[PDB]
Amino acid sequence: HHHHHHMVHITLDRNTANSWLIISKDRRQVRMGDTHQNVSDNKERFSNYPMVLGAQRFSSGKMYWEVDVTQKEAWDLGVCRDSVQRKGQFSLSPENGFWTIWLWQDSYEAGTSPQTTLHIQVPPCQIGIFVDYEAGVVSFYNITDHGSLIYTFSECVFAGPLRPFFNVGFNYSGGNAAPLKLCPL
């Protein structure tokens, strides 16, 4: 792919984070803490899952960024509507305003309803995410395997501004403590 030139500098929005997340001072990394991080509650925070949004909002254009997932056992990545539900239980699906892929239990899925099996021969250490707002496209690339395509959501109905979306995943196993990191341009 030749999407690298639409690169955007993404930073994480502390105010949207689940209360157990630790966002770095540069707002480029996030990890699961072992306890509540001593923040006040607010209506923006994801309550049920270790989720956070990027600060940037996109309503036009082509955007590309990369995320480091090295040594993680579980995570979700993609984009979502600015108006997604924050509280309680919900599915990551386009009907609920999410365009995402996951790792869980040694398999990769796309967040369709129902979910779609992904075919990845080289487990990725970095994921590239491409959004074409006007075309209604969200695509995922395997940076570890020369940029190979992972998955394309097409005919997307965004229906609002989009935000970068992250889930660091739970760490019940003690093997999923590693952070998500936004990779340099």
Ligand X SMILES: Cc1cc(N2CCNCC2)nc(C)n1
Residues of this chain that bind ligand X (CB under 6 A): 49, 74, 76, 92, 102, 104, 167, 169
Residue 8 three-state SS: coil
Which of 142/167 has CB closer to ligand X?
Answer: 167
* Least separation in angstroms between CB 180 and ligand X: 12
**Least Å distance between CB 51 and ligand X?**
8
Closest CA to 128 of 58, 80, 182: 182
**Chain mean position to CA 93:** 13
Q: Which CB sits closer to ligand X, 109 or 132?
A: 109
Q: Which is nearer to ligand X, 133 or 151 (CB)?
A: 151
The CA distance from 99 to 135, in Å, is 14
**Smallest distance, ligand X to C-beta of residue 49, A:** 6
Q: How far is the CB of 62 from ligand X (least distance, A)?
A: 27
Distance CA(116)–CA(111), nearest Å, equals: 7
- 3 state SS of 93: coil
Do 29 and 23 touch, CB atoms closer than 8 A?
yes
Q: Which is nearer to ligand X, 20 or 49 (CB)?
A: 49
> What is the DSSP secondary structure assignment for residue 21, as one 8-state letter?
E
